[PDB]
């Protein structure tokens, strides 16, 4: 399916890139396709919590 | 009781600052090109 990776994160926003190359930016309450509703943006440690229980991170060899 | 007057002095300085900030209106600038 599609996998999203953190490109940049500040307090408040997060810029994500997908495996198709599309880029998005999100805030605390926002819609993400295929993942659900954003519950918490943690600027430290690079973790994004999602309503489906998933955590959005950096690519492992690109981080 | 005397607190009304100390408060009057910090408040007086802040309100004078606010009204002098509300006074200034600056002229617009027109730029000509050729």
């Amino acid at each position: 399916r599609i996998i999203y990776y953190i490109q940049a994160v500040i307090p408040g926003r997060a810029w994500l890139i997908g495996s198709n190359g599309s880029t998005l930016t999100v805030r605390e309450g926002s819609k993400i396709p295929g993942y659900g509703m954003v519950k918490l943006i943690d600027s430290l440690q690079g973790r994004i919590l999602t309503s489906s229980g998933q955590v959005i991170k950096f690519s492992q060899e690109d981080s | 009781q005397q607190e009304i007057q100390q408060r009057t002095s910090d408040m007086l300085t802040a309100a004078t600052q606010l009204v002098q900030d509300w006074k200034q209106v600056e002229t617009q600038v027109y730029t000509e090109g050729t």
Binding site: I10, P11, G12, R13, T25, R27 | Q28, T31, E32, G33
Partner: protein, 242 residues
């Protein structure tokens, strides 16, 4: 002899009052303080690029520009055809809140807001027009406009969509279609399909076609539920939804 060691230890403690771990924690405190100082309250605005049409009727409303403190917005002006329209002059009210950079010949302005919540207005006169174009400038919203493209009603001194389909930009007004069986994209605008692919279409028959320099094809055709495609000598079929 113990005098030498005792003098040596108080001396070392006088020379370096801070331990290495204290240096590490002090550095951590300093960087955390800088991060808290530099962090921004609330959420930052969403950066967007837009495109609007400006109507010069005596009934219409002037357009609105969303700004932010310290950021740069570029304004570019085009006519009804889409060609650039050079600027004759401009006028900025309240320069203590805004600073405008402009080379004296182009059709692009770069505006930066200086204050947080003070709003103003701006007048721009183009080369061929007699009616001036008026903009209003409001900072401090939930979105920040990096670029606004403005279509002006008249015709400038300079005067297709399948080219945009070739570049990957969806055609304007279209809707997405679902394609199965191969690497292709398609859109439907006016009961016509627009297809972006690098395969070769053989059977259903097209009306016009475009090609890029590196071999990308864009086709415009009528609607059909089947396509027959052969890739570099091999014949197969692709199946579409709707």
């Amino acid at each position: 002899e113990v005098i030498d060691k005792k003098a040596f230890k108080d001396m070392t403690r006088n020379l370096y009052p801070l331990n290495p771990e204290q240096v590490v924690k002090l550095k951590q405190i300093y960087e955390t303080s800088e991060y808290a100082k530099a962090a921004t309250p609330g959420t930052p605005p969403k950066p967007t690029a837009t495109s609007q049409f400006v109507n010069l009727s005596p009934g219409s409303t002037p357009p609105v520009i969303r700004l932010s403190q310290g950021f740069v917005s570029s304004l570019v002006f085009l006519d009804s055809t889409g060609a650039p329209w050079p600027i004759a002059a401009y006028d900025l009210g309240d320069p203590s809140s805004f600073n405008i950079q402009w080379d004296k010949t182009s059709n692009t302005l770069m505006i930066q807001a200086t204050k947080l919540y003070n709003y103003g207005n701006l007048a721009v006169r183009l080369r061929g027009l007699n009616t001036p174009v008026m903009l209003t400038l409001i900072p401090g919203q939930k979105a920040v406009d990096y670029r606004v493209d403005l279509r002006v009603q008249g015709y400038g001194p300079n005067a297709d969509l399948l080219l945009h389909v070739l570049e990957g930009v969806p055609p304007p007004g279209s809707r997405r279609l679902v394609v199965s069986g191969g690497d292709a994209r398609a859109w439907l605008s006016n009961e016509k399909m627009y297809v972006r692919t690098n395969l070769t279409i053989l059977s259903p028959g097209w009306l016009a076609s475009m090609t890029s320099a590196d071999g990308t094809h864009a086709y415009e055709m009528q609607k059909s539920p089947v396509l027959l495609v052969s890739w570099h000598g091999k014949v197969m079929q692709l199946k579409v939804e709707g």
